[PDB]
């Protein structure tokens, strides 16, 4: 059952009710269904003040519905409990039934945006914009590319980068444009916990239709490698190795590393390690004694001037000491 607060009161909604579109079983079925079945319409805002519709890529909603797996640290995908596969017969029937219930109650240019899933922090990425002209005459297109920082809840944070290409497209020809997405070219550093909203807008002649594409790009921080034995004996010292390679363009300053874990460390211990220059590897060794039997987890957090709250975890099974006299 899904706990869905309403601004108030809270409602329990079965997952199958959301999947089958049983709008009417609980008052919160409609909102949960719309959260994973809505369609995005993109409107272009002009300097004249006219809000004009744009040909747009399909921005799918309700993707990769995930939860922690059973008996492991793996990721379990439960999207099939919430939605039928897109374009299937069952999904089409559910959408048609929901639309009918709601109703009763109440061009020659094509853009294909290829972007990486993530951009390394203070790093470089290459994006591709494919423009295909379906007209019999050559076209003068205005390719506008914009990178903006967005919070997790869709709130705009800061404009980062913008580009305005002027291209001539031959008739009945496909053109691929490669653009380097560089952190150093950003007008300002993205705020913490934000995501990159990469947008590509193409305007040609005076057709009034603009091709638009958008993608969400995450920011990838350096990997915090934890090396620890899989099995450990209770009341015996255990050693954990922490490795972090500085792939950034600036040295890591005010470096603090903290270790914590239930059944392994009382509260947390924070440690200071030396500054790590670019293309250098930080190696830290921690010795601690597990005291609780079972599957425990060691959590390591690293803070510096370049990035903060970089956390990684590793699981160790603590076994009881061997029986003796």
């Amino acid at each position: 059952q899904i706990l869905h607060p309403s601004a108030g009161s809270c409602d329990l909604v079965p997952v199958r009710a959301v999947k089958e579109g049983t709008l009417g079983l609980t008052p919160a079925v409609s909102d949960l269904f719309a959260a994973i079945n809505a369609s995005c319409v993109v409107w272009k805002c002009c300097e004249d003040g006219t809000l004009e519709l744009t040909d747009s890529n399909t921005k799918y909603v309700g993707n990769n519905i995930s939860t922690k797996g059973v008996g492991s640290d793996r990721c379990e995908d439960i999207t099939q409990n919430y939605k039928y596969p897109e374009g299937s017969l069952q999904e089409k029937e559910v959408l048609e039934r929901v639309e009918k219930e709601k109703m009763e109650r109440e061009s020659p240019l094509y853009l294909l945006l290829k972007a990486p899933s993530s951009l390394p922090l203070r790093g470089d990425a290459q994006i591709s914009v494919t423009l295909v002209n379906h007209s019999e005459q050559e076209k003068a297109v205005q390719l506008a590319i914009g990178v903006q920082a967005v919070h997790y809840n869709g709130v705009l944070a800061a404009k980062l980068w913008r580009k305005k290409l002027h291209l001539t497209l031959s008739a009945n020809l496909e053109k691929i444009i490669t653009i380097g997405l560089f952190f150093s070219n950003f007008e300002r550093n993205p705020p913490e916990n934000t995501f990159l909203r990469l947008t590509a807008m193409a305007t040609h002649s005076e057709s009034n239709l603009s091709c638009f594409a958008q993608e969400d790009i995450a920011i990838c921080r350096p990997h915090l490698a934890i090396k620890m034995p899989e099995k450990a004996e209770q009341y015996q010292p255990l050693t954990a190795s922490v490795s972090l390679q500085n792939s950034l363009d600036a040295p890591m300053e005010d470096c603090v590393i903290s270790i914590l874990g239930r059944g392994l460390i009382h509260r947390e211990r924070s440690y200071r390690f030396r500054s790590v220059w670019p293309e250098n590897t930080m190696c830290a060794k921690f010795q601690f004694t597990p005291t609780h039997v079972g599957l425990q987890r060691l959590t390591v957090e690293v803070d510096c001037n370049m990035f903060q709250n970089l956390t990684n975890y590793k699981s160790v099974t603590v076994v009881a000491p061997e029986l003796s006299a």
């Binding site: 059952q1 706990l3 869905h4 607060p5 108030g8 009161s9 809270c10 409602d11 329990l12 993707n63 990769n64 995930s66 939860t67 922690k68 797996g69 059973v70 008996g71 640290d73 990721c75 899933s117 993530s118 997790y152 913490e192 916990n193 995501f195 969400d216 790009i217 995450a218 990838c220 914590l260 239930r262 947390e268 599957l295 425990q296 987890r297 959590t299 957090e301 803070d303 903060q308 709250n309 956390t311 990684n312 975890y313 699981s315």
Partner: protein
Amino acid sequence: KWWSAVVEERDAQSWTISVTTPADAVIGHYSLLLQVSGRKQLLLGQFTLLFNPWNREDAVFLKNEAQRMEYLLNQNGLIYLGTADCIQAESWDFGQFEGDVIDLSLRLLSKDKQVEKWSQPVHVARVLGALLHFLKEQRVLPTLLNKRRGSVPILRQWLTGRG
């Protein structure tokens, strides 16, 4: 099936008593009292009654033991953040078995005055969700500030206001 007590082992000075509770009992803090005929009521102690995913007749019953462990007993959880194409798993300490978490949860539930419905998991879940959403609205401030140590400090700061 209902409330009952039976002596399983007995001595001259001690009784080993097995006490059962109904599968649809009201949760919360309980006081166990012993009455002797022609004598005043005596308090034997205190205990807290919880929902039982291991009991088949209970409404929160789970078929799998692994599912029971993962969804009730595991205090080390994973909250998945990031984008759809780049999912970043964040280690999270639920800490539902911390000493003060049960007392805080029951004190929050005590705001609801329909104590007869506390035996129903649906009513308890809805009341807790509404109250926790109200606490989130009242306590979460507009924008280390992003350093998190689990759900227990967040609950303590939402209820008491300190932290």
